[PDB]
Design a protein around this motif. Structure first.
Motif, PDB file in Angstrom:
ATOM      1  N   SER A 105     -65.435 -11.619  20.713  1.00  0.00           N
ATOM      2  CA  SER A 105     -66.880 -12.422  21.344  1.00  0.00           C
ATOM      3  C   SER A 105     -67.726 -12.050  20.572  1.00  0.00           C
ATOM      4  O   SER A 105     -68.885 -13.081  20.705  1.00  0.00           O
ATOM      5  N   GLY A 106     -68.060 -11.345  19.834  1.00  0.00           N
ATOM      6  CA  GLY A 106     -69.162 -10.994  18.929  1.00  0.00           C
ATOM      7  C   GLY A 106     -70.289 -10.221  19.888  1.00  0.00           C
ATOM      8  O   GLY A 106     -71.402  -9.646  19.598  1.00  0.00           O
ATOM      9  N   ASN A 107     -69.873  -9.871  21.009  1.00  0.00           N
ATOM     10  CA  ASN A 107     -71.129  -9.525  22.023  1.00  0.00           C
ATOM     11  C   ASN A 107     -71.109  -7.960  22.125  1.00  0.00           C
ATOM     12  O   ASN A 107     -70.083  -7.088  22.406  1.00  0.00           O
ATOM     13  N   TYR A 108     -72.335  -7.239  21.839  1.00  0.00           N
ATOM     14  CA  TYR A 108     -72.626  -6.004  22.059  1.00  0.00           C
ATOM     15  C   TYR A 108     -73.792  -5.956  23.108  1.00  0.00           C
ATOM     16  O   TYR A 108     -75.113  -6.453  22.500  1.00  0.00           O
ATOM     17  N   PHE A 109     -73.775  -5.239  24.194  1.00  0.00           N
ATOM     18  CA  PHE A 109     -74.784  -4.832  25.067  1.00  0.00           C
ATOM     19  C   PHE A 109     -75.056  -3.637  25.097  1.00  0.00           C
ATOM     20  O   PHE A 109     -74.262  -2.654  24.652  1.00  0.00           O
TER      21      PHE A 109
ATOM     22  N   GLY B  34     -58.097  -6.178  13.294  1.00  0.00           N
ATOM     23  CA  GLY B  34     -58.576  -5.988  12.003  1.00  0.00           C
ATOM     24  C   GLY B  34     -59.978  -5.202  12.268  1.00  0.00           C
ATOM     25  O   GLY B  34     -60.441  -4.692  11.101  1.00  0.00           O
ATOM     26  N   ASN B  35     -60.514  -5.347  13.274  1.00  0.00           N
ATOM     27  CA  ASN B  35     -62.071  -4.668  13.359  1.00  0.00           C
ATOM     28  C   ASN B  35     -61.989  -3.145  13.669  1.00  0.00           C
ATOM     29  O   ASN B  35     -60.836  -2.835  14.329  1.00  0.00           O
ATOM     30  N   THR B  36     -62.803  -2.548  13.463  1.00  0.00           N
ATOM     31  CA  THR B  36     -63.149  -0.950  13.652  1.00  0.00           C
ATOM     32  C   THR B  36     -64.088  -0.846  14.913  1.00  0.00           C
ATOM     33  O   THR B  36     -65.268  -0.846  14.418  1.00  0.00           O
ATOM     34  N   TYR B  37     -63.746  -0.421  15.977  1.00  0.00           N
ATOM     35  CA  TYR B  37     -64.619  -0.353  16.858  1.00  0.00           C
ATOM     36  C   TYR B  37     -65.025   0.987  17.260  1.00  0.00           C
ATOM     37  O   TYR B  37     -64.780   1.703  18.344  1.00  0.00           O
ATOM     38  N   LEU B  38     -66.031   1.439  16.231  1.00  0.00           N
ATOM     39  CA  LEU B  38     -66.603   2.805  16.323  1.00  0.00           C
ATOM     40  C   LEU B  38     -68.220   2.635  16.392  1.00  0.00           C
ATOM     41  O   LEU B  38     -68.572   1.855  15.586  1.00  0.00           O
ATOM     42  N   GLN B  95     -65.600   5.166  20.605  1.00  0.00           N
ATOM     43  CA  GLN B  95     -64.520   4.365  20.129  1.00  0.00           C
ATOM     44  C   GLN B  95     -64.337   3.312  21.246  1.00  0.00           C
ATOM     45  O   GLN B  95     -64.001   3.964  22.580  1.00  0.00           O
ATOM     46  N   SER B  96     -63.853   2.128  21.102  1.00  0.00           N
ATOM     47  CA  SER B  96     -63.551   1.174  21.994  1.00  0.00           C
ATOM     48  C   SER B  96     -62.361   0.315  21.451  1.00  0.00           C
ATOM     49  O   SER B  96     -61.972  -0.924  21.767  1.00  0.00           O
ATOM     50  N   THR B  97     -61.506   0.905  20.509  1.00  0.00           N
ATOM     51  CA  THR B  97     -60.317   0.163  19.990  1.00  0.00           C
ATOM     52  C   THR B  97     -59.305   0.524  20.895  1.00  0.00           C
ATOM     53  O   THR B  97     -58.259  -0.325  21.289  1.00  0.00           O
TER      54      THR B  97
HETATM   55  C1  LIG Z   1     -61.188 -14.752  33.327  1.00  0.00           C
HETATM   56  C2  LIG Z   1     -60.086 -15.137  32.214  1.00  0.00           C
HETATM   57  C3  LIG Z   1     -59.979 -13.525  31.605  1.00  0.00           C
HETATM   58  C4  LIG Z   1     -59.815 -13.663  30.053  1.00  0.00           C
HETATM   59  C5  LIG Z   1     -58.665 -12.747  29.582  1.00  0.00           C
HETATM   60  C6  LIG Z   1     -59.209 -11.753  28.328  1.00  0.00           C
HETATM   61  C7  LIG Z   1     -59.043 -10.466  28.904  1.00  0.00           C
HETATM   62  C8  LIG Z   1     -58.264  -9.429  30.004  1.00  0.00           C
HETATM   63  C9  LIG Z   1     -59.376  -8.860  30.873  1.00  0.00           C
HETATM   64  C10 LIG Z   1     -59.986  -7.788  30.525  1.00  0.00           C
HETATM   65  C11 LIG Z   1     -60.097  -7.072  29.374  1.00  0.00           C
HETATM   66  C12 LIG Z   1     -61.245  -6.438  28.652  1.00  0.00           C
HETATM   67  C13 LIG Z   1     -61.127  -5.239  27.716  1.00  0.00           C
HETATM   68  C14 LIG Z   1     -61.890  -5.685  26.332  1.00  0.00           C
HETATM   69  C15 LIG Z   1     -62.564  -4.426  25.743  1.00  0.00           C
HETATM   70  C16 LIG Z   1     -63.596  -4.841  24.793  1.00  0.00           C
HETATM   71  C17 LIG Z   1     -64.107  -3.466  23.942  1.00  0.00           C
HETATM   72  C18 LIG Z   1     -64.855  -3.998  22.994  1.00  0.00           C
HETATM   73  O1  LIG Z   1     -65.297  -3.354  21.958  1.00  0.00           O
HETATM   74  O2  LIG Z   1     -65.663  -5.182  22.823  1.00  0.00           O
HETATM   75  C19 LIG Z   1     -65.989  -5.870  21.576  1.00  0.00           C
HETATM   76  C20 LIG Z   1     -66.502  -7.062  21.666  1.00  0.00           C
HETATM   77  O3  LIG Z   1     -67.582  -7.129  22.657  1.00  0.00           O
HETATM   78  C21 LIG Z   1     -66.776  -7.856  20.718  1.00  0.00           C
HETATM   79  O4  LIG Z   1     -65.869  -7.640  19.716  1.00  0.00           O
HETATM   80  P1  LIG Z   1     -65.753  -8.345  18.235  1.00  0.00           P
HETATM   81  O5  LIG Z   1     -66.228  -9.744  18.421  1.00  0.00           O
HETATM   82  O6  LIG Z   1     -66.808  -7.632  17.520  1.00  0.00           O
HETATM   83  O7  LIG Z   1     -64.426  -8.010  17.594  1.00  0.00           O
END
Ligand SMILES: CCCCC/C=C\C/C=C\CCCCCCCC(=O)OC[C@@H](O)COP(=O)(O)O
Lengths: 219, 218
Positions: A105-109, B34-38, B95-97
């Motif tokens: 999502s590109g989201n960081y909070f 492909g991303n690194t979540y550190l 980390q969040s990988t």
């Molecule tokens: C309403 C329909 C739901 C959609 C289905 C999708 C996901 C299933 C639900 C919950 C799982 C959430 C777990 C995600 C954990 C995310 C951890 C994390 O580092 O975020 C990074 C993202 O904000 C941004 O990434 P990027 O774009 O930089 O690669």
């Protein structure tokens, strides 16, 4: 701006259960990913779980499945943490947080609640006793107050009703084997002032409605 | 669970100098996508952590460019090109990988100053406390640096153990010293049947150990 507000500090007995809230102020609660993280004082961060209020999705730390239940009311934008069979070692500051969106999502909070202090103990609310640490033997002298046998945290300490702050050191509390807390508050002053200036410590322990002023005099 | 190991545990820094914090993960943090979540956080005392850097090298909004992050796979480094007083606190990698999300144990960054010896003061218990049935003897080590300090209690020259408790203030923002209080706790009974109560302090700024004593009842 988004903001997370957590419920007030909790005091529980071993074996009891708690339920703390984390309320959101924003648009689109249902797409939040809300995390819970706890911190014992002086210690590191422990990750408890993540919840997506708009779906069934929860992810738990395996070490806490069985005690921890994450949940959320979409009508009020509030997330919840339940914890059963509390142990003394569960004493910690508990945070809710919004850090991420879905992967990709590109989201960081960086939204954190103010934390909810949880104290698990077999002890009962008790006001402190306040004893003086008196100065003695034109250089610099030290004096203080001993704030002993109170529960629970916190206590607040000032000198001369807040008019004195320079040279003051109010130490972090230590938990005694009695289950009660104990801290000192000290201050260094010129020894020439010991006959002139009055020194009073103002100890305030809200949880028990104790308010004490102790005069600290030489000899 | 992906274990995250931070070194050093403690990093004294002198304003102006560059600092370097290392985070090693027990398993690769490269995601299947492909991303690194550190990520790197800084936590100041009584406050919650604040995000500094996400996905290895990206500065969170508002974070000044003297912070940089680097590394790859299992090996990560946080650098500050020139440290400032405001950078003080505990740094955590996160980390969040992989689930469950994990954190390193923290690196404490403190201000490094010249060695300063403690002023030691000792306080006998008050008459007021003795009436209550208890005696607390308090030893104070004041405005010293660095934190490493040894405090030993001697009651009639017998070394005490297990009957004292210590706590230490946070680094003072203006002078960068620590202070410490050691409390010897006894029953009135156990107290009264001894004469010399002594607090012996060992610390880098003392040529030799300093003792502060009183003979009960003055
Ligand atoms: C309403 C329909 C739901 C959609 C289905 C999708 C996901 C299933 C639900 C919950 C799982 C959430 C777990 C995600 C954990 C995310 C951890 C994390 O580092 O975020 C990074 C993202 O904000 C941004 O990434 P990027 O774009 O930089 O690669």
């Amino acid at each position: 701006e988004v903001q997370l507000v957590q419920s007030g500090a909790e005091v529980k007995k071993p074996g009891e259960s708690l339920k703390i809230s984390c309320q959101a102020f924003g648009y689109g609660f249902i797409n939040y990913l809300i995390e819970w993280i706890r911190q014992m004082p002086g210690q590191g961060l422990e990750w408890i779980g993540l919840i997506n209020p708009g779906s069934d999705y929860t992810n738990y730390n395996e070490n806490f499945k069985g005690q921890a239940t994450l949940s959320a009311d979409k009508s009020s934008s509030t997330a919840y943490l339940q914890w059963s069979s509390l142990k003394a070692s569960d004493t910690a500051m508990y945070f809710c947080a919004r850090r991420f969106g879905y992967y990709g999502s590109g989201n960081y909070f960086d939204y954190w609640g103010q934390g909810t202090m949880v104290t698990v103990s077999s002890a009962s609310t008790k006001g402190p006793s306040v004893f003086p640490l008196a100065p003695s033997s034109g250089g610099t002298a030290a004096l203080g107050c001993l704030v002993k046998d109170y529960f629970p945290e916190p206590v607040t300490v000032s000198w001369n009703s807040g008019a004195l702050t320079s040279g003051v050191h109010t130490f972090p509390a230590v938990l005694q084997s009695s289950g009660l807390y104990s801290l000192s508050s000290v201050v260094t002053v010129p020894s020439s002032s010991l006959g002139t200036q009055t020194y009073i410590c103002n100890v305030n322990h809200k949880p028990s409605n104790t308010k004490v002023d102790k005069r600290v005099e030489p000899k | 669970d992906v274990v995250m190991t931070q070194t050093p545990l403690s990093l004294p820094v002198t304003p102006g100098e560059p600092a370097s914090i290392s985070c090693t993960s027990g398993q690769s943090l490269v995601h299947i996508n492909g991303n690194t979540y550190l990520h790197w956080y800084l936590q100041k005392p009584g406050q919650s952590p604040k995000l500094l850097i996400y996905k290895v090298s990206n500065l969170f909004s508002g974070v000044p460019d003297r912070f940089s992050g680097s590394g790859s796979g299992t090996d990560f480094t946080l650098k500050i090109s020139r440290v400032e007083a405001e950078d003080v606190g505990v740094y955590f990698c996160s980390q969040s990988t992989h689930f469950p999300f994990t954190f390193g144990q923290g690196t404490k960054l403190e201000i490094k100053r010249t060695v300063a010896a403690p002023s030691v003061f000792i306080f006998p218990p008050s008459d007021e406390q003795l009436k209550s049935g208890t005696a607390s003897v308090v030893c104070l080590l004041n405005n010293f640096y660095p934190r490493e300090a040894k405090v030993q209690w001697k009651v009639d020259n017998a070394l005490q153990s297990g009957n004292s408790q210590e706590s230490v203030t946070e680094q003072d923002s203006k002078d960068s010293t620590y202070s410490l209080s050691s409390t010897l706790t006894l029953s009135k009974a156990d107290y009264e049947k001894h004469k010399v109560y002594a607090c012996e302090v060992t610390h880098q700024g003392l040529s030799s150990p300093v003792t502060k004593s009183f003979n009960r009842g003055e």
